[PDB]
Structure formats: C-alpha cells, structure tokens
Ligand binder design. Structure first.
Ligand code: SAH
Ligand code: SAH
Ligand code: SLX
Ligand code: SLX
Lengths: 354, 344
C-alpha cells in the first residue's frame, strides 16, 4: 500500500546522504580502531571526534545517522546484557562493521579504500548534474553536467581546483584497488619495456604498474590541469597534452576509464591516434567495467550500470559497452586480435593488437 | 572483496537520481496509459513524450535510466534489442490516480529537492558544531523563513505535504472514528488546508479552520467548508473546539513543542482534544516499513529544522502532560502512522 511504499521509496535519497556524512565524520575508521568484532556506541565514536568535544548533543545526532545505516545493513546493530540488565531507558545501541562498511576503512598501510571514489560520485558537482538528468531525454545534444555548470567536465576541472582534486583522487585511489585485482589474474605486463597511460590521471596507475614490473619505463599522459597537480612518482614521466590531437609514441598503451566517457566517433579518433603512435607488435590495453550481454541482479551488472548512469550525466556520448561494442571500436581504428580478459565482477582487460 | 562492494555502495546515489528523472519525465503514468498491466519499451514510452519528438536518441537514453530502475525492483523488465518495462507495487504508487491525480510523486519530489539535498550536504555540521542546523548552513535562513522568500520551494513543500496528506487521511479514516460528532476542527500548521478539506468532506457537519503562516495561507486554494486563518502558532492559536497537529511537533524541540501545546490547551474548551498525527518511532528498529517511515523524516528533520526529531509514544505523552493534557490515547493506523489524542 501507499504507507509501505513510502518507506521503500523515501529511503532512497536518505541512505546515500547519511553514508556520505558518516564517511566525512570518519565513522568507519573510528569503529575499526576499537578492534576485531568491535561493537561501539555513538557516544564512544563521538568521543574520538575532536571537533565534537564541546557539543553535548553530538552523540545523539550521530546515533540518528548510524541507526539508519544499521536499518540498511551498512552497520551491524546489537546490545549487551549489562545494557539490558526498569526505570532507565538505554537509547544507545552498538554498531559494528559489515562486509560493505569494511571497504570504507582506509587501509593501515596506505590509506586506500572506496571512500574517495564514493565521495566523488556523491559530490555536489555530480549530484547537481544528476538534477538535470532528464535533459538527455528531452533535448537533443544536451549534457546534464553542461546544463548544471555551463561547461563540460574536463574544461570545468581546469577552472575549479576543489572539483579537480575530488575527481583526481577518486580515480587514483579506486585505480589502486582495481590494479590489485588486475595483477592477480593478468600477466600481459611482464614482457613490456615501456607503457604509456593515455588519460592516466595523476599517474597512480602507471606508478603501481612500474612498482610491480620495474623493467617498465612508465609514461603518464593527461591534460595540463591534471599534470600540474600530479605527484612525482618513481619511474614515471609526466606528459601534458590532448589525446584527441596527438598521443606520445609508446611501445604499449593503457586506456583505463577513458573510452567510456566518449561516443563512438571520438573513441575511434583516439584509438587511431594511439595506433599511429604504437610500433608494429604494440598493444593498447582497455580497462573498463564491461556491460554484460544480459543484465541481472549481480555485481557485474551494477558495476557497469553505475558508471553508465554517471557518464550519461557527466560527458557527451559517455556509456558502458559490451565486449562486441569494444571489439567494433578497436577494429574501426585498425587493431586486430582483440583479447578480452575477465578480471573480477565485470572488470576486464581488453587487449587490442597493432 | 572491494569489487563486489563497489556495486552495493556505488548504486546508492544513482538509484534516487534515476527515480527523480523518471518521475519528472512522467514515466510511470505513461506506462500506466498503455494499461496498468502493460509491458512497454523505452521507444513506446518516449513516443508519448512530445518534448522528445525531435530527439532520435531519446529512447536509448531513457532505456539507460529505466534499466537501472528495473535492476532495483522499481520496474519489471522482460524480453519480447529493446526490453519491456512494467509497473511494480512500488511504481504503482508513482502513478497519479485516474480519479484525482494523487500519488507519492509530490512528496518524493520534495524530499529529493535540491533544497533538501543541499541541506544533507551539510549534515555533518549537526554532529561537529553545537546548535548548527544543516538547512541554515546551506541556505542562510531557517526553512519556514526561506519558504517565505522562495516561491518555488514554498510550492514544492506545500504540494508534497498536501498530496501526502490525502493518502494519510485515507488510511486514518479506515481505522479512526474520532471525528464523528465534532462540530469544529482547527488544523494548527495545516498547510494549504488539504487535510481539513478531506476531514470536512467525510464529516460534513465539521466547520473546518486551517491555520498557518501568511506565506502559506496566501497561496492556499479555496476548499468547501474550510476557512483559512494566518498567524504564528508559537504566539497564539485561535479558539477551536478540537485541534489537529499533523507533522508539526516532529519539526521542533521539546521546549517549543510544550509552548505550542500550551497555546493549544489555552484555546481549547473543557472536553476538547488535540489530535497528533505522526509516524511514531518503534521501540526496536529494523529493515521494515514502520522503522523507515520514522527514520526517513527523522533524518530529514535533523537536516531541515532545529530540534526536529521523531518520537516514541512515551515521548509524545510526556509533551502532552507537560502542557496540561491529562489523558493520552495512542491509536495505531498503518505502518507506524498513529493518531494520538491529548484530552484537556
Ligand atoms: N583530451 C584529453 N587528453 C588527455 N587526457 C584527457 C582528455 N580528456 C580527458 N582526459 C583525462 O581522462 C581521464 C579520465 S578518468 C580516468 C583516469 C585514469 N586512467 C584512471 O583510470 O584512474 C582524466 O584524468 C582526464 O583529465
Ligand atoms: N509559527 C508557525 N505558525 C503556523 N504554522 C507554522 C509555523 N511554523 C511552521 N508552520 C507550518 O507548519 C506546517 C508543517 S508541514 C505539515 C503541514 C500539514 N499539517 C500536513 O500534515 O500536511 C507548514 O505548513 C508550516 O508553514
Ligand atoms: C561500480 O561503481 C563505480 C564504477 C566506476 C566509477 C564509479 C563507481 O562508483 C567511475 C565513475 C566515473 C565518472 C566520471 C568519469 O569520467 C568523467 C570516469 O572516468 C569515471 C570512472 N568510473 C569507473 C567505474
Ligand atoms: C516515509 O517517508 C516520509 C515520511 C514523512 C515525510 C517525508 C517522507 O519521505 C515528511 C518530511 C518532512 C520534512 C520537513 C517537514 O517540516 C519542515 C515536515 O513536516 C515533513 C513531514 N514528513 C512527514 C513524514
């Protein structure tokens, strides 16, 4: 009935915004610091937030966020015999991490988690674009990001240093997670002497490849406003330019999370520029979440549908593709011998050979 | 496994924004005009959108929105390249009824409105900073002051409350008979008066009075058997034989609620009652409608107004007793919705 559906539909905006608040308050990491199988109260978590130390009401407000995440199975909820054991009312339940929220705890060794990518995809710049999503259906050649912000996303990033940082860091940390999965399955880097990352962001991806395979000379290529903020990484040379004008010569190339932002004509133009800059026997690796041939209720399907909706909002022509669709782009640009390599939950390496 | 959890976590922002776009495009009503049991393609739906008629790519974009909603159990998906989409129990509640246009669309458009989402961007302020209110941090004014200067937000909020009110009262009238033999009812913070219009339609001997702020009363429609009055409920309430407070107490802290309830007490006769209509926080929370029906507004009011929160039956009784009321009768209606009578 209506008053069942109010709950099912009304919670949809609330959960991500509660999650974003919890990530910004570092709730998950604070719970993790209490140890294995920790179950802690809002009051205990708030005690570890210096910014809350003069706010008597902080724990009660925090509990209102955490109990929604508990109801949603992002946190586990429990109590104790000591709390149970008639005229006193215990409001505070105890919260613990779940499989999903463990992925929101920065790793002790290097700080990696899904936090940075999830903070990008719920950033105000992205949500403001989503408020204009209907324009793609109504208006020929409209792009929601352009309707919201008056510029395309990569042009906007060159004017807006906060957005540039959020986007660049979201891609970079997510890249680390993805390459850990790639290196467990894929052995195609072992024989390479040089790798050029085309649209490589701040260079994190090629830094990790060179760290794993130290005979590889790494080159990172991106737009001027990205290269200007890129760190110095061991074994990585940075190159600024425009991949639709000219790609540097390299023995092998990587395109990770690049083709999915662009329509077919732009993708063929870029792939022809890569072909022109590769030697005979070179290859370009495409790393993307591949759209399954039949969608279902599984991680592989959602791993493609999420960026499919984001790129529809964020850039003209951007979309997720099937293996067949990627093969067609490579073949149009002159490549032969397409080799799709499943990695994990829809993530693939697709090799295009010159 | 990070790349399993990317799907579970990354879809959380995408689903509501896809849903908002589908409601703004009137997708669910367009499917329903083929028949409530119909299963129709994106191309068939787009063909019913005049704004898309010069956009060859409209259907393909629409399909990308709808397939996410189909993966999220808001639409059914089936094969006859184009998949066919059908309504579900949830999306039937997004089809304006053929009789009167009522659905959950207006309230869901309000709770995902930019003014609300911009407040939620500031939600962490309520934890860090004593006395902050996310809405105020985001907008520079409190929500009822903002509504007075922002006609679009005023409309979205008022219409969300009003249409939601109709489905709530349909549920109330199934269970609750306490309006019978009332002769006069004052709706304190009644919005644009839809609630009292529905009560007077069911109970034709009630003289209904709708009481709200000037910026709401000046946009309220004329309803049969309803008189509109503007004022400030914290200063005084008009005399009335019986009163209604629906979705009012949950916006305010305890001291403000007791002040309002004492104003109501002063304006009631001996034997009068005030009815509180709210989603009541249950004693145990879980993954169920009663729980979420309270947690959703609890989070929204945390963001939107100082002191706002959902309350248990015990907490409501404490407010009424502090204001001089001497019998509390809680009446469950549906999925956590209650009528709570406070007797003078
Ligand atoms: N014309 C152009 N030339 C070069 N790089 C571009 C470009 N248009 C966009 N890009 C870059 O394409 C990248 C897409 S995001 C992916 C970054 C990285 N390969 C990773 O997988 O994490 C951005 O860093 C963006 O600045
Ligand atoms: N000081 C005040 N005096 C009167 N009404 C007020 C007020 N402060 C807020 N309100 C009104 O309180 C209402 C809360 S929203 C609920 C409206 C209605 N009772 C319904 O259930 O649908 C708004 O219409 C708002 O304008
Ligand atoms: C499964 O969950 C997700 C998967 C992916 C992204 C975000 C998710 O949450 C990001 C989103 C995104 C947005 C804009 C981009 O360029 C403008 C871009 O390259 C990417 C990369 N993709 C990689 C795949
Ligand atoms: C279960 O889902 C929902 C339940 C409820 C609301 C919205 C939901 O989506 C709205 C949200 C809201 C926001 C602000 C208010 O005053 C400033 C207000 O009175 C209300 C009313 N409540 C009633 C309960």
């Amino acid at each position: 009935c209506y008053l069942s559906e109010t709950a099912n539909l009304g919670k949809l905006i609330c959960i991500p915004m509660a999650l974003r608040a919890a990530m910004e308050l570092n709730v998950f990491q604070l719970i993790s610091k209490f140890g294995t199988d920790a179950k802690v109260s809002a009051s205990e978590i708030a005690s570890k937030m210096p910014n809350a130390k003069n706010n008597p009401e902080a724990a009660m407000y925090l509990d209102r966020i955490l109990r929604l995440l508990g109801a949603s199975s992002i946190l586990s909820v429990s109590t104790t015999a000591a709390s149970i054991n008639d005229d006193v009312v215990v409001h505070e339940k105890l919260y613990g991490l779940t499989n999903s929220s463990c992925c929101l705890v920065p790793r002790q060794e290097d700080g990696v988690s899904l936090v940075e990518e999830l903070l990008f995809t719920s950033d105000k710049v992205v949500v403001d674009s989503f408020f204009k999503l209907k324009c793609v259906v109504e208006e020929k050649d409209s792009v929601p990001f352009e309707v919201a912000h008056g510029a395309k996303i990569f042009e906007y990033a060159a004017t807006e240093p906060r957005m540039n940082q959020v986007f660049n860091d979201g891609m970079a940390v997510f890249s680390i997670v993805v390459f850990e999965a790639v290196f467990r399955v894929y052995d195609g880097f072992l024989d390479m002497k040089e790798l050029l990352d085309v649209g490589g962001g701040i260079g994190t991806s090629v830094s990790k490849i060179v760290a794993k395979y130290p005979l590889i000379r790494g080159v990172n290529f991106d737009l001027p406003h990205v290269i200007s903020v890129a760190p110095q990484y061991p074994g990585v040379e940075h190159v600024a330019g425009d991949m639709f004008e000219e790609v540097p010569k390299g023995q092998n190339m990587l395109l990770k999370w690049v083709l999915h932002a662009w329509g077919d004509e732009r993708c063929v133009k870029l792939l022809k520029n890569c072909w022109n800059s590769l030697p005979v026997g070179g290859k370009v690796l495409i790393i993307e979440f591949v759209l399954p041939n039949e969608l279902g209720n599984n991680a592989e399907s959602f791993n493609a549908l999420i960026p499919d909706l984001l790129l529809m909002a964020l850039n003209p022509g951007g979309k997720e593709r099937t293996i067949s669709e990627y093969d067609d782009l490579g073949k149009a640009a002159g490549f032969i011998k397409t080799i799709p390599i499943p990695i994990s939950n829809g993530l693939h390496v697709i090799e295009f050979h010159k």
